[PDB]
Amino acid sequence: YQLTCYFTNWAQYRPGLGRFMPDDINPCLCTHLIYAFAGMQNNEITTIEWNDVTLYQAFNGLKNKNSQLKTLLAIGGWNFGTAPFTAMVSTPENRQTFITSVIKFLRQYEFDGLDFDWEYPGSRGSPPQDKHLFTVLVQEMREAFEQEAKQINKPRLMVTAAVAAGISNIQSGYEIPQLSQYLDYIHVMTYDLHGSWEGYTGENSPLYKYPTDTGSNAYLNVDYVMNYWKDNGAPAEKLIVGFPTYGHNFILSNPSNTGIGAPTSGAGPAGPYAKESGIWAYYEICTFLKNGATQGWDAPQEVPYAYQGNVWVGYDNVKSFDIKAQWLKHNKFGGAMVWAIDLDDFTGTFCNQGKFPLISTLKKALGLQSASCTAPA
């Protein structure tokens, strides 16, 4: 199994104990590390933060401590949107310009591959033709990587993608069988499956449906999404399950109603570290629990929740990560990806469950405890 962990280049701006840099990553923890995010200018890949070059060096320098560790650069993300992707795939010339730039960039800064985080082909402004053009782009990148590997006599660069969990987004976004052929790994975003935008409490990443989930709401769980990808053409072995080291919080309309599907008035408060509206890092959630919140367990969906006064949070813990990992193994998927390494309790001081408690749970469960962690020769 792979254990693939996203690192975010804005975690550096968090105050005090929240500050997270590439050198805070245990190089033995994950099998793959993904750097979020790269940008695009004139159909060519670029940095986005002022100090990305320095951070790349520290990030890829972690491979000097683990001979087996591989790194990838993720281009795009939510705020990036679809416009530069649409423009880049719109002509063969623009795609070639991009692919050439990527090969040069990854080799220069010593990344082992590219993760496409186009959110999403065929939606959020992206026209219908981008569904097929995304397939074309990925195939062309894969084949360019194959050719480059032989010309310079080095291992081939990897091409992966973070992909939609919403069924509508999947249907308008991906030619699954064709796309799966050329991608090395498919990182399925099996989280953000519920949120305050719905007007009621719901879990961030429930494994199974809740009894009341009817119609299209029955699709908002890890099991359905992963199986949808598999049943519609993606090989299980290439499919990577998304694991969140964060939760979504809510403001309860009635503090007396604290169950799944309880009416809410909006997003819960930003945390003191990640400072994200409606989102708490796992370590921020641990503070919530320590400060007197009541623990809940969503039994049908195998995930925890917690509430105090008018604040409700749906999240993942050691128990839920374990259950999901056992499920993953039973279904013979390629492994797990984690958003994000900087949201786990990396210091171990918030949750008192050791360093990186959530990711460590996956490392143990996926048979990676005895994985090689030695500097290269």
**Per-position x/- string for 193-232, each x denoting binding to ligand A1BEM as judged by CB under 6 A, each - no binding:** ----------------------------------------
Of 78 and 297, CB closest to ligand A1BEM: 78
* Whether residue 119 lies in the annotated active site: yes
Beta strands in the chain (DSSP E): 2-8, 32-41, 44-46, 70-76, 113-117, 158-163, 185-188, 239-244, 246-252, 264-267, 279-281, 294-298, 303-308, 311-314, 335-339
Give how many residues touch ligand A1BEM by CB under 6 A: 9
Where do we find the tokens 């968090």? 14
**Per-position x/- string for 139-168, each x denoting binding to ligand A1BEM as judged by CB under 6 A, each - no binding:** -----------------------x------
User: Which two structure tokens, joined as six digits, stand for 346?
Assistant: 């990396």
DSSP H stretches of helix in 297-347: 318-331
Catalytic residue among 44, 119, 276, 302, which? 119
Task: Give CA angle at 358 (357, 361), nearest 5°.
Answer: 85
**Please, which of residues 9-48 interact with ligand A1BEM by CB under 6 A?**
none
* Phi/psi of residue 308, nearest 5 degrees: -155, 125
Contact call for residue 261 and ligand A1BEM (CB under 6 A):
no
Contact call for residue 81 and ligand A1BEM (CB under 6 A):
no
Residue 26 annotated as binding site = no
Are the CB atoms for 254 and 264 separated by under 8 Å? no
Contact call for residue 297 and ligand A1BEM (CB under 6 A):
no
Contact call for residue 189 and ligand A1BEM (CB under 6 A):
yes
DSSP 6-66: EEETTGGGS-GGG---GGGS-TTT-SEEEEEEEEEETTEEE--STTHHHHHHHHHGGGGT-
Distance, CA of 151 to CA of 377 (rounded, Å): 24
- Give the sign of the dihedral formed by CA 319, CA 321, CA 323, CA 325: negative
Of 121 and 148, CB closest to ligand A1BEM: 121
Of 148 and 234, CB closest to ligand A1BEM: 234
Contact call for residue 300 and ligand A1BEM (CB under 6 A):
no
Contact call for residue 342 and ligand A1BEM (CB under 6 A):
no
Contact call for residue 52 and ligand A1BEM (CB under 6 A):
no
Binding-site residue set for chitin: 49-50, 76-79, 120, 189-192, 339
Q: Which residues bind ligand A1BEM (CB under 6 A)?
A: 77-78, 117, 119, 162, 189, 192, 279, 339
What is the set of active-site residues?
119
